[PDB]
Amino acid sequence: KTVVVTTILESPYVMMKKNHEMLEGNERYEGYCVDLAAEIAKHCGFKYKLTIVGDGKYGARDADTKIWNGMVGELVYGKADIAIAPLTITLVREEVIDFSKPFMSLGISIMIKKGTPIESAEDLSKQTEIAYGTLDSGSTKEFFRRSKIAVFDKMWTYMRSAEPSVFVRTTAEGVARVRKSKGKYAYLLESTMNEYIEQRKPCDTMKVGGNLDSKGYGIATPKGSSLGNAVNLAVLKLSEQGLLDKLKNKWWYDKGEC
Amino acid sequence: KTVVVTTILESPYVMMKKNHEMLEGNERYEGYCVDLAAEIAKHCGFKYKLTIVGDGKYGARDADTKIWNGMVGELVYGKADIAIAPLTITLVREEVIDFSKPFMSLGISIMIKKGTPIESAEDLSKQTEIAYGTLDSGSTKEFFRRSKIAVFDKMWTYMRSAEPSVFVRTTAEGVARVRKSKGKYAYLLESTMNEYIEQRKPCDTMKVGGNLDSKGYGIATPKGSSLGNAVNLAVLKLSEQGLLDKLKNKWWYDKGEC
Amino acid sequence: KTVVVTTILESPYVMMKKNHEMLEGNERYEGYCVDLAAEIAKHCGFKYKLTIVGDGKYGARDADTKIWNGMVGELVYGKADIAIAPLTITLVREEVIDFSKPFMSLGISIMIKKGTPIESAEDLSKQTEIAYGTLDSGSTKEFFRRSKIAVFDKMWTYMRSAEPSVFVRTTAEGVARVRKSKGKYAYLLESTMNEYIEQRKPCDTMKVGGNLDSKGYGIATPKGSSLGNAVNLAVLKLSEQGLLDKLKNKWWYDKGEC
Ligand SMILES: NS(=O)(=O)c1cc2c(cc1Cl)N[C@@H](C(Cl)Cl)NS2(=O)=O
Ligand SMILES: NS(=O)(=O)c1cc2c(cc1Cl)N[C@@H](C(Cl)Cl)NS2(=O)=O
Ligand SMILES: NS(=O)(=O)c1cc2c(cc1Cl)N[C@@H](C(Cl)Cl)NS2(=O)=O
Ligand SMILES: N[C@@H](CCC(=O)O)C(=O)O
Ligand SMILES: N[C@@H](CCC(=O)O)C(=O)O
Ligand SMILES: N[C@@H](CCC(=O)O)C(=O)O
Ligand SMILES: [Zn+2]
């Protein structure tokens, strides 16, 4: 039984392998999460099909509709057997899907175009010149939507009324937006992505500040999926074998272009 | 059946005719909106009675009570069939009443007694010496109250807290307050009134800076009224036949005194 | 359902990005109306497909055939769910389609090559040296065609009978013609496009005089469409949150080249 892995195009976790669009199969993709999926499938002894979540969303439960979209939805509604993505372990997702132990640590972080007078979330919150937003339908946005933390809950008050929307559809759009914004837009996103981008040409962005929180990417499987246990042990195996570090190095730093 | 037209004594939209005491019914009044109402009535083929809004207000929803006052309330509660007044098309209002397309454009503008060291909203927001307020129960106030724009949020933060109240009940009061404040009061009001006032003796006020927002006056009708369509088309007709411009010229600039 | 947004390639409202040779769906497009469509959609919470009106016309009822072309037609004949375009609210159009409140004001204005012996429509109406025309199949043409106003009537009389046609198929054609005409052609186009063009290199054109009239672009939906309401409310929300002015700034002025 081929495990349907839901994942999302998000560098460097999962990326079309240059010139593999026209291709098919898992080999098309590359990235930390593709390798991870590999080491996971190998350690759990399963065949998997990497599928890119249709709506290209990580997963959020639509308010009112209550319907999970993105990779979470995939798992929740049985469209996918497992999500091997920079899928943030969050409480609201862990209620509806299972998460392996984190295979990666990240925090919400601020990406700014280099030179933006922003050193912290506080800075962002304390000012108006510089818009900032998050991926919509992602844990970051939810982090802010939900945070009682005075500075975030506020950053949210701003972001949620912000217009144009400070929310971007994709990390690339946030990043593009930061780059295109002449520093007038700060993108709140996961330090791992932020760190990846920081290391990619045009190298005009950087992570400033520490992370606004600490979380992890877990491999998500549907609630009570039998894969969960295997995958979880796999992740831990992988972690202890230094594979995750090896992978993170491979995908973040070994290709550093800055 | 005689259309009850709610309107508001607001120059030069609706004004008691110099005599007026010797006149009855519609003929008491003259002004852009009286003329507009005449042509709207003629073009929608209804007989109407101009009636001034009891509370002389345009209309805002009372927080807590959620009751609408002013012309909006007159429509909302079925005291009037139509509002033909410089009634600003706003989101909260369009939610409870219908507006023809705007028959007049306006923006929130600043009226200052001539010679006030203010050239913009940013200026007012940046200082404390010159008070500034808007008509309460009006769209200008609601604009600031609901504005997320840094400068206006600041301004609203100030105005909402200003003591004594920077808000006025009538434009006449705001205008008087400007004229009497020796430049210590800037009146945030709609450019149309501001322009009109600018052009009337004592010619001591002026609009400064551009409009803070762009909006329109719409002939309002109760949500889902039949008149709405007719009135809307009549407004478009009147607009296109140049009547609106002819009326605006007649009432704003033909009478100019400065 | 995915709302089908008809709109028109008209800078800066809707324009092909720059690599629209590598993007799909809505991201191929950029511009004020593209941004407008996005927030409109985000606020009305619908998915949309931007689709450029086939005939690249705005909408005019073909005399004799009585068939609406352009985006009006697209809406009138059910090909589009909504037009998010510099579509002029006009009487004839509101008779067949629904317009939101205007999301942008404009007036018919005269674009002349900078330094053209023209300062007004009266000026144009008085002379024959400077040809002037409008966009054909536009509200601007129809304004003149249908104008009862002596001057615009004379101008119409002139334009309709001017040879070669003073009318142009596109704004670019009109603009090019202004430029190429060494100032012997005045383009009567909406102030907004006039202003946009003014702001674009070669900066050889300018809006002269006031507008001949005042109208707005509204987001159009088929008559009695459910969307109309939400979109109208969206437009108002957006307008009040300063979005439309931000967009206007972003697309007109923030890239100003003159
Ligand atoms: N940085 S940290 O060690 O304090 C830290 C780490 C994690 C925290 C919280 C904190 Cl304060 N949350 C967990 C979530 Cl998955 Cl429930 N992940 S974590 O990276 O181990
Ligand atoms: N300039 S103005 O305020 O007098 C003005 C504005 C509009 C008018 C007419 C006039 Cl006279 N027409 C409407 C059309 Cl949509 Cl029926 N639009 S408008 O910009 O609000
Ligand atoms: N300044 S502008 O022309 O771009 C403009 C005009 C109107 C906007 C917003 C903007 Cl940004 N909002 C609408 C709503 Cl208030 Cl009914 N009216 S408008 O005058 O056509
Ligand atoms: N990793 C995030 C997506 C990126 C973000 O939200 O910043 C998630 O699972 O929702
Ligand atoms: N036209 C405004 C009143 C004037 C103002 O608010 O300044 C309204 O409809 O509320
Ligand atoms: N916006 C216009 C087109 C341009 C023009 O007519 O000048 C319309 O809706 O017809
Ligand atoms: Zn390969």
Side-chain angles (χ1 to χ4, degrees), chain C residues 2-20 22-23 25-41 43-46 48-63 65-118 120-121 123-127 130-145 147-148 150-153 155-168 170-244 246-252:
Chain C
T2 307
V3 173
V4 169
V5 176
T6 185
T7 175
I8 187 157
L9 289 183
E10 183 79 59
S11 312
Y13 300 96
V14 186
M15 309 174 282
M16 307 307 219
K17 282 246 244 148
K18 187 175 142 60
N19 35 34
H20 72 79
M22 138 185 240
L23 305 159
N26 295 340
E27 42 260 347
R28 324 202 290 297
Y29 302 109
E30 62 166 8
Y32 177 94
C33 280
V34 171
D35 289 347
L36 184 43
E39 274 265 53
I40 294 293
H43 281 271
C44 303
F46 61 75
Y48 58 106
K49 181 180 54 181
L50 294 180
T51 89
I52 306 311
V53 63
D55 48 26
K57 291 167 173 308
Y58 282 92
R61 187 185 274 121
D62 176 301
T65 212
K66 297 304 183 301
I67 291 180
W68 285 97
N69 57 19
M71 298 174 272
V72 181
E74 298 288 338
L75 304 173
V76 171
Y77 302 118
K79 313 298 192 49
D81 291 299
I82 189 169
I84 299 185
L87 189 65
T88 303
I89 301 160
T90 61
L91 168 63
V92 297
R93 286 169 184 179
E94 183 64 9
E95 299 187 338
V96 300
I97 69 180
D98 284 351
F99 278 106
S100 68
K101 292 310 186 289
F103 59 80
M104 184 174 297
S105 312
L106 62 300
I108 290 164
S109 59
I110 309 165
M111 161 183 307
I112 52 165
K113 191 144 189 297
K114 283 180 162 167
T116 293
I118 289 307
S120 65
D123 277 18
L124 290 175
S125 73
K126 281 169 160 36
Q127 58 84 64
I130 299 149
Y132 47 93
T134 75
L135 189 60
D136 78 354
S137 169
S139 56
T140 300
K141 193 170 171 191
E142 309 317 324
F143 171 83
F144 285 97
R145 171 194 311 286
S147 177
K148 276 46 172 184
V151 165
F152 300 146
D153 209 303
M155 294 175 80
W156 174 237
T157 286
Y158 156 84
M159 283 174 308
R160 76 178 182 201
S161 301
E163 293 177 350
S165 169
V166 284
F167 306 102
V168 301
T170 62
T171 297
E173 190 183 348
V175 162
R177 190 160 172 178
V178 165
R179 292 165 170 165
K180 300 153 79 63
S181 77
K182 310 173 180 185
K184 294 299 182 174
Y185 180 82
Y187 186 37
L188 305 172
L189 71 173
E190 303 175 323
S191 53
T192 48
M193 287 143 203
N194 203 340
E195 288 160 356
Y196 171 73
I197 299 302
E198 218 163 3
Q199 290 317 314
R200 314 309 295 182
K201 283 168 74 177
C203 324
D204 49 5
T205 74
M206 78 187 318
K207 172 227 266 35
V208 278
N211 295 337
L212 285 51
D213 73 344
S214 290
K215 25 200 192 176
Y217 301 140
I219 292 172
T221 41
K223 205 80 189 142
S225 164
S226 75
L227 254 196
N229 183 42
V231 159
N232 190 43
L233 287 188
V235 176
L236 287 186
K237 180 111 177 67
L238 261 27
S239 160
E240 276 150 52
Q241 304 305 13
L243 181 43
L244 296 178
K246 239 177 219 86
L247 261 15
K248 173 131 200 198
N249 289 336
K250 173 172 168 193
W251 288 109
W252 268 254

Side-chain angles (χ1 to χ4, degrees), chain B residues 36-46 48-63 65-118 120-121 123-127 130-145 147-148 150-153 155-168 170-181 183-212 214-244 246-254 256-257:
Chain B
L36 177 49
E39 259 291 80
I40 286 287
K42 155 193 220 274
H43 285 258
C44 299
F46 55 79
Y48 60 102
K49 190 186 52 198
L50 296 175
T51 87
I52 310 308
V53 50
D55 58 22
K57 290 189 171 295
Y58 285 83
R61 175 179 279 149
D62 184 286
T65 221
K66 302 303 190 283
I67 292 161
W68 285 86
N69 57 28
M71 287 179 281
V72 173
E74 289 257 337
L75 296 183
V76 167
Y77 305 117
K79 305 319 184 56
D81 299 306
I82 185 175
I84 297 182
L87 188 70
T88 298
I89 300 173
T90 68
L91 176 63
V92 287
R93 293 177 180 171
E94 179 71 41
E95 291 194 336
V96 304
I97 59 174
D98 298 331
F99 279 98
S100 74
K101 288 310 184 309
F103 61 78
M104 183 159 327
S105 302
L106 66 297
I108 298 161
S109 60
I110 298 166
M111 167 190 284
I112 55 158
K113 192 172 176 289
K114 278 162 181 190
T116 301
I118 291 296
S120 63
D123 285 7
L124 292 169
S125 81
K126 269 165 170 47
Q127 58 84 55
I130 301 150
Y132 51 98
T134 74
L135 189 74
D136 58 7
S137 263
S139 59
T140 298
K141 181 171 168 198
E142 310 321 325
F143 164 82
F144 284 100
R145 179 199 307 280
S147 191
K148 272 71 179 176
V151 167
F152 310 147
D153 203 334
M155 296 174 65
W156 173 253
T157 299
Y158 154 84
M159 289 183 286
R160 78 189 185 205
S161 310
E163 300 286 6
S165 184
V166 286
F167 307 112
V168 297
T170 65
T171 308
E173 184 184 351
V175 165
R177 183 153 169 185
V178 167
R179 291 171 168 164
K180 294 159 55 85
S181 73
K184 297 317 178 191
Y185 185 80
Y187 185 45
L188 299 174
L189 78 172
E190 294 166 340
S191 48
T192 42
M193 282 150 204
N194 201 344
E195 286 150 12
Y196 178 74
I197 295 287
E198 207 173 28
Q199 285 312 320
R200 315 290 304 173
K201 303 168 68 174
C203 319
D204 53 357
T205 67
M206 67 178 328
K207 184 210 274 61
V208 272
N211 299 346
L212 292 52
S214 262
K215 20 200 201 166
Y217 294 145
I219 301 194
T221 40
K223 206 74 193 160
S225 162
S226 64
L227 269 175
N229 186 45
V231 164
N232 187 35
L233 308 176
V235 167
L236 291 183
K237 187 112 184 71
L238 270 27
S239 171
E240 277 145 44
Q241 297 314 2
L243 175 65
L244 290 198
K246 183 169 289 98
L247 252 28
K248 167 137 200 196
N249 295 323
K250 157 165 181 197
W251 288 109
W252 265 261
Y253 305 125
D254 287 0
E257 301 167 335

